[PDB]
Amino acid sequence: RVKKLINSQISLLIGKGLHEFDSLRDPEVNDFRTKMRQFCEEAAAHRQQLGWVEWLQYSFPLQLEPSARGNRALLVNVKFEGSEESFTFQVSTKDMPLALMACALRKKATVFRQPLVEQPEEYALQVNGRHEYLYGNYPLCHFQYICSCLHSGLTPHLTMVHSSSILAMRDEQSNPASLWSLEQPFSIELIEGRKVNADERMKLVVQAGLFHGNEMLCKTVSSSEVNVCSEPVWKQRLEFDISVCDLPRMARLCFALYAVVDCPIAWANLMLFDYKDQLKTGERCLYMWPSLLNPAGTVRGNPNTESAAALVIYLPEVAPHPVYFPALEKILELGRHGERRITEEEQLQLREILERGELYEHEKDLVWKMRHEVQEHFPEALARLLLVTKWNKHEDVAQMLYLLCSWPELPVLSALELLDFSFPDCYVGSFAIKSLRKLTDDELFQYLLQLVQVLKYESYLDCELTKFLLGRALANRKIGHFLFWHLRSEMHVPSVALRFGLIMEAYCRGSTHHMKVLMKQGEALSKLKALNDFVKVSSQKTTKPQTKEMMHMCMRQETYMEALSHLQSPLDPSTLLEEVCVEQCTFMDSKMKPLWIMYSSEEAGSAGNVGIIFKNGDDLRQDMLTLQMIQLMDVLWKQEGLDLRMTPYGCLPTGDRTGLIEVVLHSDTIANIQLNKSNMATAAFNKDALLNWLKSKNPGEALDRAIEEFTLSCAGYCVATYVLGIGDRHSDNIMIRESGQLFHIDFGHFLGNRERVPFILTYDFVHVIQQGKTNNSEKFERFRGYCERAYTILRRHGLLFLHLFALMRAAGLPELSCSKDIQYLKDSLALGKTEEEALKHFRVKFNEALRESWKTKVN
Ligand SMILES: COc1ncc(N2CCOCC2)cc1S(=O)(=O)Nc1ccnc(-c2ccc(CN3CCN(C(C)C)CC3)cc2F)c1
């Protein structure tokens, strides 16, 4: 009764009926579902018995300041859960939550004239009207919430929540109750093709290659030219220059059907061994993807069989019995035997190339020969060694694996490199995952987007990365929340819909309660899509105030009021979207008419006043990636004591060309501010407009802080947009907060898009930095130091950006497709240079931007 209901809820939530999984009659799919359902149910059972503080860590993970990861007076308002009464008292930013709780309990004991049985140790502090809590031994300023309150001048509002109330939360959210002997050359039979569409004047060719990730295992082989028709017949043997015994475990056979007089038509790939390590034999009908060879492409066929071109091949029965890939112990027994001492002049050449990339043929022979010295004295150079390993020789792969199986754990930075498609071996991926287990939940969340993209490179459904991601998502509700949405937003992509659908179902088995919370979000998103469609049509016939009044009426319907109210925000599960403020809702006049949905919450006070933007028609993945990169910059800067007052607002794709963007309230575009309308708080010179607007928002002594906020954030965005190559910057996509913080929006073009984006300096912004003065080198040169400091901090982490962007090539974003896009980051970060050379080059670029800025000052 309940299992049937849950299955129907999973189907609606993931956007694909579970019956469709069953209908594939696919053993691999069935074994994934069984194994992962069991793995996720164990996680759920472990969670239901967690202690009350451990359950707060699961459900409300701490939001700490980046500097606090791994003195001053403060007013705080504290209430108790079943109370309207509140106590405002002064604490120190260095006090711990326990002291604040003990203080609140003394105030409650004297007001209620009774000495209390409850100890401060029995409570946690909830941020009012948010799924956010303050707990643990950390000073108040170490929490992101208190730190945020400190800068914005607002008073923290906290609610004392008792352990029994937290346990009541935990309880109501419960789940219900031998190859190496086969020396023959590898070969296949190209039988025939189906549903082929091509120019009848041309001829058809099938090119085939053997790959181990990016590297070709042997030379490619082509079929003979056969006349173009819908059902081509070849019925010919294709033989490769590699012995069957040497095919590595992760070998893939890649096809490309094209037309010749070049006209690409289709591609299809497959793993030579199955998920149970057995070499494949018999016929295979390969349903091809429309387009020369595509090795990174998926190894599962095109699901649109009704119209996909197919390629029938035959994998020969190389043995009278099934052949399985050797078990690890047999590989290790073979690799155990090898040879290790060569010249100090050869040793010195190894230290130069390992601390240097690309290298010559003789240097590969030197790195391979000294592989034991690589393991012992340069363990972090494992990736260079794996690249020199000849993956087409089964005995060199066995020696690489013997060293790998005793390789010391590498740092997270090194592991993120190893997840790249250039390291397709399963043991290498397993080693990379083992070195990633030490990632904190905060580091994991920072890199989650890249780890999800790595799933598209996985050759098999059940893998160490999926289990690692599912285990982390079930142990942290915020990780779980975003893993769900990163997968859900790609269900319209046929190449990932099965893998992603299966991960989402398995996660759902682990948290029935969270599945229901996510349904409530999908219901709101469903209604927002209908509302945006209504707005796009109505905006073409009537005026903006009429379409807005019609939008409000459609929102005031009972179905909309229920669907859109009392939900956790997809942008941030800590943010509660309570009462939709229909009157404050609106839409932008851009082509897709994005909706601006406003919310309030009595419980949360001013912090419950939040906005979300529903956007349908544009792809939001590039915006999300850019905004995550700016947030990563902000974390790296704050880790060095540098706060550039950045505004990395939320952006989350949720569906096909659909997603949400977090509203930053009290913000306006530079264009609106520069409109210089009359009867407002009105410049003599348009250059005075931003500064006058800052003055009206920050009177008296507050102007100085607003100018400083502007300066810091301007330096941060100047460096961020330059490093990332964000172009097409104009007054309509640069915003300013009433606090003075400048920020950028609308990141549809990055990494040059394809020119080399120069460093930018705007006169109107220089004018604010210079406090409205023509000459103010004191304030201007403080700003130049903020820029150089920010830039030099990012260069020190250049490899982190490079590794993350390399993992993102799997996303298929058009402006991040090849090594040419990664080159842009190398050039902007000047990674081939020393710090002095790169600082000299940054100074030349900043000075160039100043002379260009002066072409406006001169006018
Ligand atoms: C990529 O899209 C976005 N990215 C970030 C934001 N961000 C918007 C700000 O928060 C961060 C995200 C918003 C959008 S969008 O989808 O709304 N598209 C664009 C495009 C150009 N310009 C804008 C704009 C134009 C004018 C204004 C000025 N505000 C004044 C205050 N009202 C309220 C009182 C209703 C709204 C208009 C803002 C714009 F964004 C909005």
- The angle at the Cα of 746, spanning 741 to 749, to the nearest 5 degrees, equals 125
- Calculate how far, in angstroms, residue 652's C-alpha sits from the geometric centre of ligand 1: 15
Query: What whole-number distance in Å separates Cα of residue 100 and Cα of residue 156?
Result: 12
| Maximal C-alpha separation, the chain | 97
Per DSSP, 140 falls in state G
- Calculate how far, in angstroms, residue 749's C-alpha sits from the geometric centre of ligand 1: 17
Of 551, 584, 588, which is best to mutate to test ligand 1, by the most ligand atoms within 8 angstroms of its C-beta?
588
- Calculate how far, in angstroms, residue 758's C-alpha sits from the geometric centre of ligand 1: 26
- Residue identifier of the C-alpha nearest atom 16 of ligand 1: 594
In which order are the strands placed within the sheet that holds 667-669?
667-669, 734-737, 742-744
User: What residue numbers bound the domain in which 463 lies?
Assistant: 328-516
For the CA atoms of 802, 806, 811, 816, what is the dihedral angle to 10 degrees?
70
Task: Answer left, alpha or beta for residue 605, where phi above 0 means left and psi between -120 and 50 means alpha.
Answer: left
One domain for residues 277 and 340: no
Give the pair of three-digit tokens for residue 265: 């038509």
Pairing of strands 73-80, 157-162: parallel
Q: Which atom of ligand 1 is nearest to the CA of 743?
A: 11
- Calculate how far, in angstroms, residue 515's C-alpha sits from the geometric centre of ligand 1: 31
- Residue identifier of the C-alpha nearest atom 2 of ligand 1: 746
Query: What whole-number distance in Å separates Cα of residue 143 and Cα of residue 37?
Result: 36
8 A C-beta contact, residue 397 and residue 326:
no
Per DSSP, 217 falls in state S
CATH number at residue 258: 2.60.40.150
Start-to-end CA distance of the chain, whole Å, equals 76
One domain for residues 342 and 490: yes
- Calculate how far, in angstroms, residue 810's C-alpha sits from the geometric centre of ligand 1: 30
8 A C-beta contact, residue 354 and residue 373:
no
- The angle at the Cα of 668, spanning 665 to 673, to the nearest 5 degrees, equals 155
Resolution in A: 2.3
Q: What is the DSSP string of 467-517?
A: HHHHHHHHH-HHHHHHHHHHHHTTTT-HHHHHHHHHHHHHHHHH-HHHHHH
Residue 205, strand partner residues:
258
What sign results for the dihedral spanned by CA atoms 673, 649, 849, 820?
A: negative
Query: What whole-number distance in Å separates Cα of residue 553 and Cα of residue 314?
Result: 62
Query: What whole-number distance in Å separates Cα of residue 434 and Cα of residue 409?
Result: 8
Query: What whole-number distance in Å separates Cα of residue 4 and Cα of residue 9?
Result: 9
Which residues, at least 6 apart from 478, have a Cβ–Cβ distance to it below 8 Å?
A: 61, 441, 445, 573, 574
Q: Residue 613, exposed/middle/buried by CB under 10 A (0-12, 13-18, 19+)?
A: buried
CATH number at residue 505: 1.25.40.70
Which residues, at least 6 apart from 592, have a Cβ–Cβ distance to it below 8 Å?
A: 532, 536, 615, 616, 617, 618
Q: Which atom of ligand 1 is nearest to the CA of 590?
A: 20
Q: What is the DSSP string of 1-45?
A: -HHHHHHHHHHHHHTS-THHHHTT--HHHHHHHHHHHHHHHHHHH
Q: Which atom of ligand 1 is nearest to the CA of 664?
A: 10
- Residue identifier of the C-alpha nearest atom 8 of ligand 1: 663
Of 575, 581, 661, which is best to mutate to test ligand 1, by the most ligand atoms within 8 angstroms of its C-beta?
661
Q: Residue 434 in 3-state DSSP?
A: helix
Q: Which atom of ligand 1 is nearest to the CA of 615?
A: 16
* H/E segment holding residue 639: helix 621-639
Query: What whole-number distance in Å separates Cα of residue 223 and Cα of residue 313?
Result: 12
Query: What whole-number distance in Å separates Cα of residue 390 and Cα of residue 385?
Result: 10
Token pair 């994991």 is found at 444
Count of beta carbons in the 10 Å neighbourhood of residue 516:
14
Give the pair of three-digit tokens for residue 676: 């210089």
φ, ψ of residue 159 to 5 degrees: the values are -120, 130
One domain for residues 375 and 274: no
8 A C-beta contact, residue 721 and residue 713:
no
Query: What whole-number distance in Å separates Cα of residue 546 and Cα of residue 704?
Result: 42
- Residue identifier of the C-alpha nearest atom 25 of ligand 1: 669
φ, ψ of residue 479 to 5 degrees: the values are -60, -45
Expt. technique: X-ray
Q: Which of 672-679's residues contact partners 24+ apart within 8 Å by CB, and which partners? A: 673/736, 674/731, 674/764
- Calculate how far, in angstroms, residue 39's C-alpha sits from the geometric centre of ligand 1: 43
Query: What whole-number distance in Å separates Cα of residue 53 and Cα of residue 41?
Result: 22
Q: Which atom of ligand 1 is nearest to the CA of 649?
A: 11
Q: Which atom of ligand 1 is nearest to the CA of 663?
A: 10
One domain for residues 421 and 509: yes
- Residue identifier of the C-alpha nearest atom 5 of ligand 1: 745
8 A C-beta contact, residue 394 and residue 246:
yes
- Calculate how far, in angstroms, residue 772's C-alpha sits from the geometric centre of ligand 1: 27
- Calculate how far, in angstroms, residue 674's C-alpha sits from the geometric centre of ligand 1: 16
- Rg value, the chain, Cα: 30
One domain for residues 271 and 353: no
Residues within a 6 A CB radius of ligand 1: 586, 588, 590, 594, 596, 613, 615, 623, 649, 661, 663-664, 667-669, 672, 732, 735, 745-746
Query: What whole-number distance in Å separates Cα of residue 505 and Cα of residue 498?
Result: 11
One domain for residues 304 and 422: no
CA distances from 815 to 131, 273, 623, 650, 707 (A): 37, 34, 12, 21, 35
- Residue identifier of the C-alpha nearest atom 32 of ligand 1: 668
φ, ψ of residue 454 to 5 degrees: the values are -60, -30
- Calculate how far, in angstroms, residue 664's C-alpha sits from the geometric centre of ligand 1: 9
Token pair 């359950």 is found at 55
Of 590, 732, 745, 749, which is best to mutate to test ligand 1, by the most ligand atoms within 8 angstroms of its C-beta?
745
Query: What whole-number distance in Å separates Cα of residue 138 and Cα of residue 807?
Result: 34
Give the pair of three-digit tokens for residue 497: 């819909």
What sign results for the dihedral spanned by CA atoms 849, 852, 856, 859?
A: positive
Query: What whole-number distance in Å separates Cα of residue 335 and Cα of residue 329?
Result: 10
Query: What whole-number distance in Å separates Cα of residue 179 and Cα of residue 396?
Result: 15
Give the pair of three-digit tokens for residue 124: 């946690």
Which residues, at least 6 apart from 511, have a Cβ–Cβ distance to it below 8 Å?
A: 44, 173, 175, 474, 477, 480
Of 610, 613, 673, which is best to mutate to test ligand 1, by the most ligand atoms within 8 angstroms of its C-beta?
613
Count of beta carbons in the 10 Å neighbourhood of residue 565:
14
Query: What whole-number distance in Å separates Cα of residue 661 and Cα of residue 339?
Result: 58
Q: Residue 115 in 3-state DSSP?
A: coil
Query: What whole-number distance in Å separates Cα of residue 813 and Cα of residue 629?
Result: 15
Of 746, 747, 749, 750, which is best to mutate to test ligand 1, by the most ligand atoms within 8 angstroms of its C-beta?
746
- Calculate how far, in angstroms, residue 449's C-alpha sits from the geometric centre of ligand 1: 24
8 A C-beta contact, residue 18 and residue 7:
yes
- Calculate how far, in angstroms, residue 735's C-alpha sits from the geometric centre of ligand 1: 9
One domain for residues 192 and 302: yes
Query: What whole-number distance in Å separates Cα of residue 487 and Cα of residue 35?
Result: 20
- The angle at the Cα of 66, spanning 738 to 707, to the nearest 5 degrees, equals 25
Q: Which atom of ligand 1 is nearest to the CA of 746?
A: 1
Secondary structure in 3-state letters for 381-420: HHHHHHHHCCCCCHHHHHHHHHHHCCCCCCCHHHHHHHCC
One domain for residues 300 and 390: no
786 Cα distance to chain centroid: 28
8 A C-beta contact, residue 725 and residue 659:
no
Q: Residue 591, exposed/middle/buried by CB under 10 A (0-12, 13-18, 19+)?
A: exposed
Q: Residue 707 in 3-state DSSP?
A: helix
One domain for residues 280 and 367: no
* H/E segment holding residue 435: helix 426-436
8 A C-beta contact, residue 457 and residue 447:
no
One domain for residues 483 and 350: yes
Q: Which atom of ligand 1 is nearest to the CA of 592?
A: 16
Q: Residue 836, exposed/middle/buried by CB under 10 A (0-12, 13-18, 19+)?
A: exposed
Query: What whole-number distance in Å separates Cα of residue 710 and Cα of residue 644?
Result: 9
Count of beta carbons in the 10 Å neighbourhood of residue 111:
10
Chain breaks of the chain after residues with C–N above 2.5 Å: 70, 177, 261, 291, 340, 356, 681, 753
- Helices 464-475 and 27-48, axial angle in degrees (round to 10): 30
One domain for residues 339 and 294: no
Query: What whole-number distance in Å separates Cα of residue 356 and Cα of residue 374?
Result: 14
One domain for residues 295 and 365: no
Q: Which atom of ligand 1 is nearest to the CA of 598?
A: 35
Residue 572, strand partner residues:
569
Secondary structure in 3-state letters for 562-580: HHHCCEEECCEEEEEECEE
What sign results for the dihedral spanned by CA atoms 546, 551, 552, 557?
A: positive
Per DSSP, 730 falls in state -
Pairing of strands 595-601, 605-616: antiparallel
Task: Answer left, alpha or beta for residue 93, where phi above 0 means left and psi between -120 and 50 means alpha.
Answer: alpha
Query: What whole-number distance in Å separates Cα of residue 587 and Cα of residue 551?
Result: 9
